[model samples]
Target: IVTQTMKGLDIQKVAGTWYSLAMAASDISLLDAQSAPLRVYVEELKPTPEGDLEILLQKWENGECAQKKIIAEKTKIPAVFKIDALNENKVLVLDTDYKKYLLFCMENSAEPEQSLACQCLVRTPEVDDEALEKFDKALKALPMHIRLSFNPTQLEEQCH
Candidate 1:
């Protein structure tokens, strides 16, 4: 089952590249071997006076990478992220933003068309058989699409 806790996460340590252990589609693995083992390069990690950190996310794909930035307004407490689950060679990332939490499945690689799965994240830690169904409902409730993708493997890794 998927569970979430705010402990054990070294925000600084987690602020680096992460490899995906799962893919979006069946043919995703067959398209590109490098796509399966994607990476996420993080930058501009700054803890707010309130204790929340603003971060940039860069994605690596097909021998290239892209970037996106997210700024959490500010909080009186430190924002925390936790590992929800890992099995079948895949991992789930859990974090809270603006009083809402999210859970995402990471894959090693995927095809360009199947990239949506790579950005599939939910606003809650509901990880039962119906978890995905709930996620879909929540996704539709979003005001606008929140999925963004970039390939960051092409850029030089830097510390910020």
Candidate 2:
């Protein structure tokens, strides 16, 4: 019953382009200096034939977007994916709206981004004010430390 229950999760719904606005990291010394927000312009989460996820990651820094590849294999549990390329950990989908929001966890033990512990990826479908308010409300409920790299202030800067 347990295995079957995990397989029942709809991978199709999680597949798509996600635009992230804000991020709440594990807020620990593990992630002292890392990319938190806007670094990820968009993430293309595609489902593999074998229930895995192929993430085409896009990060924006300075003023340009860089692309990278990441894959998550299917695990024994539901809504959980194992990522070996980055770390020995799984990112769990805490919540998703299919069209807009997806809150996924990049755990500390996963050793993400080179020795980092946990990270809360707060994503949405658009980079605008609408998503900002929603992301704020979402982060308020989660219990964690304040991000080491926060106090966002570069949005108004020249984009090009």
Candidate 3:
């Protein structure tokens, strides 16, 4: 079973623009860093009894930002952001509303860039299993691409 660290987290870090680094059919190089950045403006930050962070993910396209609510269930929250295994930097975020979970691995540079390494779990139990299988299959199917490496060690060291 997938485990989370920051359970019952009610934080507001969703209001703003978040650019998409990579996807299945898309490459990170295709993004116009200045223009085509993925934007997510949070309209509300709701707290749930299950200990999850519920907010909206707004998309900015065609000169306008559209409203798309996504509930991110916080798995873990560490004392030291860097040392925290389930920190924002390394965590599995699940959107309960959409019934989707994203495993994100981010760049550990001064200015970090993020990539969605894997997509697992869906709304329904059956679909969640299917999605997990698809994620595994896609990883095996995709061609080798040099991932942008990060220094989690440096992050931890510097923070400490």
Candidate 4:
């Protein structure tokens, strides 16, 4: 459960790039769950005319860089995101500063009654008092079967 949905995230301020500060996913080796931090480049979150968001995520994998794109189609539920037409996943905006950081929780519909848990954090360079506070609580309030957790990843100086 989230403290609250980002009441009114400023779409314009949500633009620009963001680095992945921390992430949590479900079902993985405990060691690898919070293992070496995943290399994250930055986020390019663009708002569509109809309230959908075009998200561009760039990252490093296996000594190379790659980019992934996802369209969070607008739904009536406010900060919730429908990742795909039939992706069986919903991205929830648990928190965000519209500039410095963002925390999200994703619930994926499994077989019938089981839902997977995934959490994440995206932020700018600053890790100030407010951001730290939010990040701390965000991770703490999530489930324990988290498959992944990212923290203490240094921000890179280059990206797309």
Candidate 5:
């Protein structure tokens, strides 16, 4: 149910800090309060020499915010990436406005079936109606049905 990735994605424009506004996943439990490990605050995204994305993120670990870095290996597709370190994670930039908001879709190895998670990220800490509208629009456009749409409250408390 993964939709096409954003065309002509400019990795440079996607660098820097991004705040998580909302999130949706095939399994609601993965995005709930109990799943702190699954929610990460993106500190910065740096482009590598091969055009891969180096993700600097912070997450709740042992009741403390910890930083971690992962490389999202680039593929033939401009906006799709593979993260072997994350249980065969495949991520796509579903939509973005570069400076305003970004929509992402991810599929990773899970239990009996592959689980999908989508994220809505904005440049500012405060999310306005425009950001929500764009996120909603992208969600509705996806082939996969959204099971739960929730704010990233746990993520909001991280890295600060």
Candidate 6:
């Protein structure tokens, strides 16, 4: 149950702008690097007609902000997806409330212990108490090294 995706996730309901609030990972060293792959900030999730999820990501790189779109290929399950970039991994939608918060995890399908990462997203920059609670519960359920929490000022700096 640690990395299980939600059963009845309605992708359409959660398809919109989502701000990265916090991130957790098993290997904190990767997350601590200057050019971490997980540093990519989530912008939007748009569902395609073929049932895939298109993720628009904003990344801070080389003194500039760049954008990228990655399509998460869908399976029979609504919340489970696969995105094979340099390698194949399952993108699991752990939990979401559609309006206020969303939480997801990405783990190596071949080696579950490696490349395990989770991120919490919210509708706004100001995360409410309820949202924080849900995030905390998820963290407890699936323990990992707490890497980073995106604060308002930090996001403002990255806004450039």
Quick one: best lDDT, which candidate? 6
lDDT ranking from best candidate downward: 6, 5, 4, 2, 1, 3
Candidate topping TM-score: 6
lDDT of 4 by residue, 30-101 (tens): 214222233333467777777787777665444546676777877777788777522345767777867667
Tens digits of lDDT, candidate 2, 24-89: 544444333334332333356888878888877654444455566778787777677777643345
TM-score (C-alpha) between model 3 and the true structure: 0.30
Q: Can you tell me which runs of candidate 4 are displaced by over 4 Å?
A: 1-3, 29-42, 59-63, 85-88, 111-123, 145-153, 157-160
**lDDT winner, 2 or 5:** 5
Candidate lDDT values, in order: 0.33, 0.49, 0.32, 0.54, 0.69, 0.73
* Model 3 per-residue lDDT tens digits across residues 1-160: 1223234423443322232222321235322231334222223345445555444434454555555554455533520122121112433433222223232331222323343232232222222444444354444543323322113232122110
Model 6, range 86-123, lDDT digits (tens) per residue? Answer: 24368889888889888898777786555777878887
Candidate 6 regions with alpha-carbon error over 4 angstroms: 86-88, 156-160
What's the TM for model 2?
0.60
- Who is ahead in TM-score, 2 or 3? 2
- Superior candidate under TM-score, 5 versus 6: 6
lDDT of 3 at 48: 48
**Candidate 2: Cα lDDT at 73:** 80
The residue-level lDDT of candidate 6 at 148 comes to 73
| Model 5 lDDT per residue over 1-160, tens place | 3665799888878888887767676555555563344555666778887789888777666666778888888988888988754344787888888887888876764531336667777777666568778777876754443343334464356653
Tell me the lDDT of model 2 at 23. 54
lDDT, candidate 5, equals: 0.69
lDDT of 1 by residue, 42-78 (tens): 4334544443445455544544555655444322223
Q: Per-candidate TM vs. native?
A: 0.28, 0.60, 0.30, 0.69, 0.81, 0.87
Kindly report the root-mean-square deviation of model 4 from the true structure over all alpha carbons. 4.7
Whole-structure CA lDDT of model 3: 0.32
